[PDB]
Symmetry: C2
Subunit: 277 residues, 2 copies
């Protein structure tokens, strides 16, 4: 569950898209080239959109949801779709299933009625969503190969922040660093970076690249402090990895208002006709 | 998930009982020798009772539930409690969670509202049960070590029945054999036999021991047909294994009406006071 390239994820996602196309066509009600089907690239936009809808949900989640939970939930959502089609299991539901499962896994103390209680729908509407999470729970757990422990960036982040503040007492005002570094971490979390690097490299990139966004530079930081090494890197590599992630977020295209509007409708029209009977 | 003795399961169950006692006592509200706690032997009675309540539920389950499902569900229930206390997770709920998970795992086509629809409770009461299954789903899956595939006796049973009817055309009236052998299989399913032997040995014992209950004896059956061997046994062992299971069901003490009434009340009084805060 930590891959070697954007190409490797591209392939997996493509496979998932074909597998459904073939299943749908196999179950007769549609021709192989029917434009009802979403293209891998279209699935992606919808996933970007839902991952954002996922983030919003967690942000407003009244019983204040810890960042370990929101991070875990997003990792699930991503991994699910590396080999599953948006056309087969609706991401509106899978998204909410990832949040719930994540609360359970991370032992975040919240009951299901409390959880669905955070949805802007009538009491029965919310009960209905609770029902759908029961439907997809095992599916989600199975599609994750039963590997539910996900290591988030927030832990090594707090550690790097600690390292800096005691090592460079000048910046004893990290309250500014943290907020910036958090903003940047959120952007990385929206790319495939979580599936591509260690959470430490991810935490490190958020901090060094945010302090730097601020102007300040600790030219002796990596060398002096990080003579130590936990996640594979003779300094140089790390510098390239940071350049790599820093690039990923630079080239991240957010879902656009209207395309989503179209693709949602396609996705809805897809779940509408029995393609999966 | 196939053990070497009733002693091995006895130990596991005992451990589970102590672990809770210690957790409860650790969380202060109770003394180590408080009679509120159930003894391992008492847990057992309650489990026998619930496994029967489990069987009844599946029997009346309107969208006719296949025997693979009911068998799988009972295996879960048993395995859950090999290392978990009835005092900690109520078997009324775990029982229903095992049924649901089993429908999902075996791909028995039934939705959650359909499932809970089979409970003799008001619409909200049933929704409440659906909620509790969502609560315990992951727990159940985790406590099963993520091993959800359970091989039932019904498959090799149908095969042995086929073997007999073509090999001894006299008994071409197996409709009688089957019903008897099924009745006996139900009795084995209530003992630890499922956790102790292969489903083939279990299927074989149900058939050979039921034909025999009927009077008829095929002295050339094992030797002539079963020169073949899939599950460890130089004839002799098998004969001893059949003697073993045949013994287990002989010495199975069903839960008694009033003791249950008491133990339920103890169990309820247990879940009543916060022992698990």
């Amino acid at each position: 569950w930590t891959f070697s390239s954007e190409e490797q994820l591209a392939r997996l996602r493509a496979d998932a898209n074909r597998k459904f196309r073939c299943k749908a066509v196999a179950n007769g009600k549609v021709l192989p080239n029917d434009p009802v089907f979403l293209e891998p690239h279209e699935e992606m936009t919808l996933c970007k959109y839902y991952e954002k809808r996922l983030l919003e949900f967690c942000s407003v989640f009244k019983p204040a949801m810890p960042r370990s939970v929101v991070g875990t939930a997003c990792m699930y959502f991503k991994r699910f779709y590396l080999n599953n089609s948006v056309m087969e299991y609706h991401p509106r539901i899978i998204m909410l299933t990832c949040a719930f499962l994540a609360c359970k896994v991370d032992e975040f103390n919240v009951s299901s009625p409390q959880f669905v209680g955070n949805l802007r729908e009538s009491p029965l509407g919310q009960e209905k969503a609770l029902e759908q999470i029961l439907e997809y729970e095992l599916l989600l757990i199975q599609q994750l190969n039963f590997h539910l422990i996900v290591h988030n960036p927030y832990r090594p982040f707090e550690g790097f922040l600690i390292d800096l503040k005691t090592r460079y007492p000048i910046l004893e005002n990290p309250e500014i660093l943290r907020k910036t570094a958090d903003d940047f971490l959120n952007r990385i979390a929206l790319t495939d970076a979580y599936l591509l690097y260690t959470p430490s490299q991810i935490a490190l990139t958020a901090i060094l690249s945010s302090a730097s966004r601020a102007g300040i530079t600790m030219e002796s930081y990596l060398s002096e402090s990080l003579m130590l090494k936990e996640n594979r890197t003779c300094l140089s590599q790390l510098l390239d990895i940071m350049k790599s992630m820093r690039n990923l977020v630079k080239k991240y295209e957010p879902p656009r208002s209207e395309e989503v509007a179209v693709l949602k409708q396609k996705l809805d029209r897809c779940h509408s006709a029995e393609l999966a009977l």
